[PDB]
Amino acid sequence: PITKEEKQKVIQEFARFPGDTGSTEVQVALLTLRINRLSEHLKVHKKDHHSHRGLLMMVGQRRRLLRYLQREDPERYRALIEKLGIRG
Amino acid sequence: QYRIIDFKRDKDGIPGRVATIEYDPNRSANIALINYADGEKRYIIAPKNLKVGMEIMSGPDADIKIGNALPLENIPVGTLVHNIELKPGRGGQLVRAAGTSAQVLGKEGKYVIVRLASGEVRMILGKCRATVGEVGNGGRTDKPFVKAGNKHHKMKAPNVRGVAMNAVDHPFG
RNA sequence: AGCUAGUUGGUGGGGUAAUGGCCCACCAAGGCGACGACGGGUAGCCGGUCUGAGAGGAUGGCCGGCCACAGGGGCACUGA
RNA sequence: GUGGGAGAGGGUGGUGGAAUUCCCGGAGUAGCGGUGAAAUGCGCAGAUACCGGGAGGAACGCCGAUGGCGAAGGCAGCCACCUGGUCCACCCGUGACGCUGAGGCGCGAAAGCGUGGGGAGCAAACCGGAUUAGAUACCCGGGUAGUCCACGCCCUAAACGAUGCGCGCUAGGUCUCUGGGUCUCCUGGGGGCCGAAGCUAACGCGUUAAGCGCGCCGCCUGGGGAGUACGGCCGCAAGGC
RNA sequence: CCGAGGGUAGGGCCCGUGACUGGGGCGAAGUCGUAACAAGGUAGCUGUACCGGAAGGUGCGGCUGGAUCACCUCCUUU
RNA sequence: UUCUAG
RNA sequence: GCGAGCUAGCCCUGGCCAGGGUGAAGCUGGGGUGAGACCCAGUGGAGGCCCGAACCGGUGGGGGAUGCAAACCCCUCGGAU
RNA sequence: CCGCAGUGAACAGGCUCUGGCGACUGUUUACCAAAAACACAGCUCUCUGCGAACUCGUAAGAGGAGGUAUAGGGAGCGACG
RNA sequence: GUCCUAAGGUAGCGAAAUUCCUUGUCGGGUAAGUUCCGACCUGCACGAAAAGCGUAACGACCGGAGCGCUGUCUCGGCGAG
């Protein structure tokens, strides 16, 4: 599972400003991290269709947050994608 | 390649290291070279599992460590095995790639119980051995001999059949 | 539910009152479609006309405009 | 964000009695079992009942509830492993990032199919017994596919609350669960019941709206033939859109 | 060279159309039966599966648009 | 258990 | 008693199939989704697979019937890693 | 550019429409018959725990099989649906 | 409504190569069609396991039809070895 101090090292990593506990930078970082150890969980455990559907909601939650930053500032969006590595 | 090899351990204290994946064509068994301590080897049983990186053996002692094998005496209850050690040392006493081995489903005095892989049940005896672990035969079943006749390719008798014949030919025939 | 070889564009050029793949050469391949393309069914389009409290339904023969056809199917001449 | 909290949401592994039917031993008789009354059936080669032992699936009593979770179907002996949703408090952080959704895309009862285990019990089909006029059904005695699991396929239904989703406005009394508080009660969610306004053709809904208003969706528009025929897509097929 | 027309071949959209046959609707009324509304007599309806002169029945799932106290466990409250 | 239509 | 230098088999051990055609697993790259399913394009080269010589055969017709021959000649045909 | 002809000669499928059986490449009755006959990949019952069961054998013994119930033998059909 | 039997043919098929009464009766194909092919089906005597209905591809298998083409035939008539 996700450790509490792991969560903070991620929040510290993505923050532009000391105190960024909640922002586009954190949401996507959280959701993408939550996407890579939930999908990892579904490969074994092939039939966890209740938690797969709850993942897919979160998959759509990511994209719409991503959508917003391109809608406003696509400059830091290219900086946010590359750093994470999503889109292909 | 038209040959046999191993089938029954009885020299122990020996270091059992899972030789390798020499999946083998000659008895429905798929075995890998088992590297012993001295260096003496053996294309050993195919009791599925025990990864390349060998790492096993047996012993008068114990070590259920899947695969591996000792006497009946030295064996759990509710256990699945093969290396069917029927009589006292008769080496293997059954289960050839016959995956579903036997399951010491209850033992008794100089007599240990066995679920007859094949399809029945009764008892063995004392020291009598047998190594747990699965088989190896990937359901060595099925698989299509399509527009041809694997058979032939058998090298394995088209000893073909008949039954209808024109005659009155061969035993009970 | 796919549609396309003159088909989409370009260079040069024939022809025409002259634009235009309009016809041709050579070149690159695009052009289109659910904001319904291709196909099928049916059709003279309107001013006006009948009806309708109305919005909206129908309809557009004679009078008028533009257009089409001259038994069916084409082509050229003379020529503003 | 953080900090708590609840739950039969899920899926992987694992263990726990209770009993059920079969199997070996003990004991011990003459009857059992069965209905509306019988009969078929079992049993003197000793059954039914009791004792003890075994093996095996399959559920999972009490707690358990008019209660709970969940997107829909649907989900309950304990165990831990991954994991989803969802709820109070701090008001910290982003800064309108939104609400609906043709098609798609995924799920998704139970029946069924495909292959590969397994099958204690239940049980269409089929088999006897009864039955009546007739018994292809109710009732009784048997018993197979299935029901069980892995994996892949179907996706249908009184799939129900017969009633899209979102936000916002319009008295209350009352039962219960969850989260917080100055915890005779106030607070936010959630569940049952009564009931003012109001809607209604009718019942009845009634801040869990069938009230009042805003978005965007799907569906209506006479009864049978029909939800069928034909063309099209889909399934191994039964069918299905 | 382009082309009106004519030919042989190949397909596509459709109307006609046929021994025969599936069903569907009429029609005075015919036979055989009870399925259904009162538990329609076994409450009914449904997805589906098998079977049965025919309505239907039995099984797995379920929905009540199922209801009485002719019986049990209790519940819920002054 | 069954007993047409007006 | 006699025989697989007949022929049907079976064991052991060598040799042999001129050319050509079709283009599955794979691996490379690109393709809307989370990874994928899965699509396409390239490469690729299987199959008792196709077209056919030698070689194996011996339907379908022709000749031959004191034949060339106690099964052969002619046209034809199937198989062809 | 030429002839009636331009794989010029020579080696080189007639195609189609339909039905029945067996699926299919096959294999076989040497000197008539290559077929809807056997063979099959594939199904189902099934005897067998080993020193197997069946086959040769006067007793050894071989076979089976250095196989071991995803196996070995007995079989009626002979994809797949 | 019954008499006997252990029950007393079910789903698919049908004059099939199991149907002699028969060139059965209707339909199509034709200038006529006792072969076909479709349909009925009183199945002289199909039927699920020596399977049953069908089935793409597949066959020197068997039977039915159309175009193409030729002395196969309307008698041929000439010629070469």
PDB file of C-alpha atoms (C1' of nucleotides) in Angstrom, chain D residues 1 89-93:
ATOM      1  C1'   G D   1      -4.479  18.167   2.038  1.00  0.00           C
ATOM      2  C1'   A D  89     -14.058  17.504  11.954  1.00  0.00           C
ATOM      3  C1'   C D  90      -9.785  21.298  10.739  1.00  0.00           C
ATOM      4  C1'   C D  91     -10.665  25.015   7.380  1.00  0.00           C
ATOM      5  C1'   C D  92      -5.180  24.654   5.698  1.00  0.00           C
ATOM      6  C1'   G D  93      -4.192  23.974  -0.348  1.00  0.00           C
TER       7        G D  93
END
